[PDB]
Amino acid sequence: IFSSYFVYLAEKDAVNESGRVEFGSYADALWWGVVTVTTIGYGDKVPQTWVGKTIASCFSVFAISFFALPAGILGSGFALKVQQKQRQKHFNRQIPAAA
Amino acid sequence: THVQGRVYNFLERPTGWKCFVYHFAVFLIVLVCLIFSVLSTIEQYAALATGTLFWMEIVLVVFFGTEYVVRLWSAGCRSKYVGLWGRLRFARKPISIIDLIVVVASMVVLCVGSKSAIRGIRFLQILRMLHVDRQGGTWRLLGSVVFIHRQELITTLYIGFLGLIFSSYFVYLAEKDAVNESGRVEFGSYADALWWGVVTVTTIGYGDKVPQTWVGKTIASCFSVFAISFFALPAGILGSGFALKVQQKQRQKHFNRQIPAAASLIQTAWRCYAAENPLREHHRATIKVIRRMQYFVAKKKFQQARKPYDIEQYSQGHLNLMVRIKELQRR
Amino acid sequence: THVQGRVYNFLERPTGWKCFVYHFAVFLIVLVCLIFSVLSTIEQYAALATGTLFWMEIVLVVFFGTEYVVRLWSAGCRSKYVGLWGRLRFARKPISIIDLIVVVASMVVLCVGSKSAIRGIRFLQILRMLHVDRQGGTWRLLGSVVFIHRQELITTLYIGFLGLIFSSYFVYLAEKDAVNESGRVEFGSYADALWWGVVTVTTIGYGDKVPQTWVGKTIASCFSVFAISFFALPAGILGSGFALKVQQKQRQKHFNRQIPAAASLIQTAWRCYAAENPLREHHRATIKVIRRMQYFVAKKKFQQARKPYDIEQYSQGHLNLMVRIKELQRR
Amino acid sequence: YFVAKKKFQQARKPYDIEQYSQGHLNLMVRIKELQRR
Amino acid sequence: DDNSYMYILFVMFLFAVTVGSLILGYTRSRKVDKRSDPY
Amino acid sequence: DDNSYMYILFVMFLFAVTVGSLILGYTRSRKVDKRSDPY
Amino acid sequence: TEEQIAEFKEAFSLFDKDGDGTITTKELGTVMRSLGQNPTEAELQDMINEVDADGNGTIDFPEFLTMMARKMKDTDSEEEIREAFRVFDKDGNGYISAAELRHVMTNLGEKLTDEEVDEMIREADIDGDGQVNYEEFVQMMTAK
Ligand SMILES: [Ca+2]
Ligand SMILES: [Ca+2]
């Protein structure tokens, strides 16, 4: 929300190589934010002014980390719950043979 | 003193099913306001943002301008700061330095625009998202997980930035004079080749700049694999570090529950032994009932303070070891 | 000998709040220099890089040309090498082989350009980033984590490169003769289809080459999922491996603290027992004070050598087990 | 016999990730010294 | 920009769900005693 | 290339923060005894 | 205990070279230096940091008497010295040889003299073998 507003302030009036303006509104700059925060990088909207490329660099690294976080989090969490079912499923086998 | 302390517990570090409403609702009002503000730049939905939005902003700064003074006046219920000179160190708390900047700067921008003016309202309307998340309970997690893992983060950022500084210079030497399919030169300067380095080292791959000469594609391949690994490293590092700190808070939060229920048993067992000496006789005939009555409640609370652990199957290294010492101890 | 050893500890493996300044400041000077060097290729900011930058480079090589000789002369304070013939194995240390190449090669390039010339200064000005990170404490971590995990890395790189060699050949067979939307043929050769394989196996996706025939899109889908997994594997592998080696250094670094405080207690307790026999009488009247005095300081240091562990809640498998043996042992 | 004694102590003391005694540091000794009493 | 209000509304609404979950967590919290844990 | 100095300055400055943190770590280090640990 | 609680106070204020009730931590850095120690001021301030439980630095024995009234021989400080052998133990049993005990005695912490460390393991190696057991030492340290 923050750093995809500074890009729009840096790129509110600047045209492409083909005569159109990319960052026309805030929603265009936010489509860009979601797209570049999840590392898609379609390539429809690239900031052309050299102020906006610096902000895109900073926000790129410092938010690609925090959006790539839940993959590792749920990857530990899924392999720790099936091992917590293969404890109680063995403990359900142990009781009638200890009876 | 009652009222001031109640108001502190209500506005800061809040608790109770209605404080939630208040705070989250102030936040949802901020969110509606910022939504209309960002829709005021679509050039086709700009008619919706009329002057009533501006007066809904001036009543909003009217609300926050007394909200800050309420939280300032209700700050003297703290042992860390008292009075008026002590309360300045309450305004060292950076959420309050952010909030003061928000309310006074938005008031100053609204005054000059009422006697690029509306553009400054967007930044000081984005900033009001941060000040309703109280207690800073999120940044304290990240600022400690990064500090615990400072060695590996500094190591992989140094190696990745060294690979980016080095191998995005060889591409520029391999592509200093070569044109695109459309008549322009991509890698004109070093900064173009470095924009490329950051972009291809974080696996974005926009596609504005691709090396055309076949020397540069080999270097791009090598540096691609051997630095995509070192820039994808901190995701896994902080992913372990975040799930290891919340489990280190759910140890001490259970250990803070165990202690008053390991106090309520001993302090009541001494009471149950003190039946000899605390008409003064039939008043002592009733206390032997209650000192045996509440002792069993304390006994239930102590067994409920250790048996529910939390990830509750963590006895899987010491299954028989907790019993194999005690049965030896009984012999 | 004092001076030479002091200079060694100062230039190499340095310590103390001022050595930091010296080293990091030399590094920041290198960084300003490389910044101006890479701005000398923007074709619009090229006026800033005048000849005073070249003379700031020749005074820089003047500074490093005596810095290397200072670190060479201050090398004889080491047990590994002495004198002049021994010091050649000090120049086997690859940071010094890098530094010698830097200073002599930059001097040689500056001599011929003073009697593509300025272009060689950029590489030998990028190389001076590496030589101020002393001790090689970063590459020793990575070169051991890769060596510990050699099996899984070799396995997944073999499977991923086999999938890349195989399935980026079927795309070329499916797309050998097919034109783009703009009149060119993308997959002309095998190397074009392999550039595509590396690019799409590391999830870049530039977009210069997309398979157009509907046979090739299916193969691209299959090989996309089933090799993106095996190329995203080493991030998680090295992410575990880096956070497991720093915790294996914070074991032995605490165990190096525990030993001199487990020596200072026993060596002082023997001193406290040796009160019988070390006017010679009142001099022995004072030593019984000090042998009981410093023993308590050693006792505090030994309990501060084991109770602060480090991730300090690691007693969560053996909570009652450290006490349930001792209370059995007292019976 | 002494060569075999050296080989058996070289068969258990080099473990492998060789600092895995960090849950049972004093527990391997606190049973044996109890066992000697 | 025909349906371009939708993007803004959706991103702001995901942010709102996350912040609301944070506030529920802090309110449904149990105690706020700063220094009473190891004593 | 209007504001094109900014990109170079920013990337080089992030590298500088990382290398400075490395140097602080090595200086604020405690000892440099090579072979004195297991003896 | 009745015969030692009087003449000990003559040695208690003996460091100040006066009659004041002062442990004289500022003058202890001269008294111990006159005895032949000469420590640093950091270790000197660390002495009364844990020796004097009051907290001033010079005392009329609240803890200077309690330093004397801590025999360091009961079961509250007999296992903490027994843990100091366990940091040096290899393969259990308290294997510690005379060569290894001399190796650790003359090298680490606060070192002994050679005339002290040469005869320190003498009564703990009465059998003459390569195992100075800790139980044979703390039995000698039982009266310490
Ligand atoms: Ca005095
Ligand atoms: Ca005192």
From Swiss-Prot, chain D:
Changing residue 1 to S: In LQT1; uncertain significance. Changing residue 21 to L: In LQT1; decreases interaction with KCNE1 C-terminus; does not affect plasma membrane localization; reduces IKS current density; impairs binding with phosphatidylinositol 4,5-bisphosphate; loss of channel activity. Abundantly expressed in heart, pancreas, prostate, kidney, small intestine and peripheral blood leukocytes. Less abundant in placenta, lung, spleen, colon, thymus, testis and ovaries. Changing residue 4 to V: In LQT1; uncertain significance. Changing residue 23 to D: In LQT1; uncertain significance. It is found in: Cell membrane; Cytoplasmic vesicle membrane; Early endosome; Membrane raft. Changing residue 30 to S: In LQT1; uncertain significance. Residues 14-37 are annotated as: Interaction with KCNE1 C-terminus. It comes from the Eukaryota. Ubiquitinated by NEDD4L; promotes internalization. The ubiquitinylated form is internalized through a clathrin-mediated endocytosis by interacting with AP2M1 and is recycled back to the cell membrane via RAB4A and RAB11A. It is linked to Long QT syndrome 1: A heart disorder characterized by a prolonged QT interval on the ECG and polymorphic ventricular arrhythmias. They cause syncope and sudden death in response to exercise or emotional stress, and can present with a sentinel event of sudden cardiac death in infancy. Jervell and Lange-Nielsen syndrome 1: An autosomal recessive disorder characterized by congenital deafness, prolongation of the QT interval, syncopal attacks due to ventricular arrhythmias, and a high risk of sudden death. Mutagenesis experiments were carried out by expressing in Xenopus oocytes or COS-7 cells KCNQ1 mutants either individually (homomultimers) or in combination with both wild-type KCNQ1 (mut/wt homomultimers) and minK (heteromultimers). Belongs to the potassium channel family. KQT (TC 1.A.1.15) subfamily. Kv7.1/KCNQ1 sub-subfamily.
From Swiss-Prot, chains E, F:
Ancillary protein that functions as a regulatory subunit of the voltage-gated potassium (Kv) channel complex composed of pore-forming and potassium-conducting alpha subunits and of regulatory beta subunits. KCNE3 beta subunit modulates the gating kinetics and enhances stability of the channel complex. Alters the gating of the delayed rectifier Kv channel containing KCNB1 alpha subunit. Associates with KCNC4/Kv3.4 alpha subunit to form the subthreshold Kv channel in skeletal muscle and to establish the resting membrane potential (RMP) in muscle cells. Changing residue 30 to H: Found in some patients with periodic paralysis; uncertain significance; alters voltage dependence, lowers current and diminishes open probability in KCNC4/KCNE3 channel; lowers current in KCNQ1/KCNE3 channel. Belongs to the potassium channel KCNE family. Signal peptide: none annotated. Expressed in hippocampal neurons (at protein level). Widely expressed with highest levels in kidney and moderate levels in small intestine. It is found in: Cell membrane; Cytoplasm; Perikaryon; Cell projection, Dendrite. Interacts with KCNB1. Interacts with KCNC2. Associates with KCNC4/Kv3.4. Interacts with KCNQ1; associates with a KCNQ1:KCNE3 stoichiometry of 4:4; produces a current with nearly instantaneous activation with a linear current-voltage relationship and alters membrane raft localization; affects KCNQ1 structure and gating properties. This is Potassium voltage-gated channel subfamily E member 3. It comes from the Eukaryota. The lineage of its organism: Eukaryota, Metazoa, Chordata, Craniata, Vertebrata. Residues 15-26 are annotated as: Interaction with KCNQ1. The chain crosses the membrane at residues 4-24. The gene is KCNE3. It comes from Homo sapiens. The chain holds residues 54 to 92 of 103 of the full protein.
UniProtKB/Swiss-Prot annotation, chain G:
There is a cross-link at residue 17 (Glycyl lysine isopeptide (Lys-Gly) (interchain with G-Cter in SUMO2)). GO terms for biological process: autophagosome membrane docking; calcineurin-mediated signaling; cellular response to interferon-beta; cellular response to type II interferon; detection of calcium ion; G protein-coupled receptor signaling pathway; G2/M transition of mitotic cell cycle; long-term synaptic potentiation. Ca(2+) 4 binds at residues 125, 127, 129, 131, 136. Ca(2+) 3 binds at residues 89, 91, 93, 95, 100. There is a cross-link at residue 17 (Glycyl lysine isopeptide (Lys-Gly) (interchain with G-Cter in ubiquitin)). Changing residue 137 to L: In LQT14; reduction in calcium affinity; not changed protein abundance; not changed structure; significantly decreased thermal stability in presence of calcium; no effect on RYR2 interaction; significantly reduced ryanodine-sensitive calcium-release channel activity; impaired negative regulation of high voltage-gated calcium channel activity; impaired regulation of cardiac muscle cell action potential and. Ca(2+) 1 binds at residues 16, 18, 20, 22, 27. The modification N6,N6,N6-trimethyllysine is found at residue 111. The modification Phosphothreonine is found at residues 40, 106. The modification N6-methyllysine is found at residue 111. Ca(2+) 2 binds at residues 52, 54, 56, 58, 63. GO terms for cellular component: calcium channel complex; calyx of Held; catalytic complex; centrosome; cytoplasm; cytosol; extracellular region; myelin sheath. Ubiquitination results in a strongly decreased activity. This protein has four functional calcium-binding sites. Calmodulin acts as part of a calcium signal transduction pathway by mediating the control of a large number of enzymes, ion channels, aquaporins and other proteins through calcium-binding. Calcium-binding is required for the activation of calmodulin. Among the enzymes to be stimulated by the calmodulin-calcium complex are a number of protein kinases, such as myosin light-chain kinases and calmodulin-dependent protein kinase type II (CaMK2), and phosphatases. (Microbial infection) Required for Legionella pneumophila SidJ glutamylase activity. This is Calmodulin-1. It comes from Homo sapiens (Human). The lineage of its organism: Eukaryota, Metazoa, Chordata, Craniata, Vertebrata.
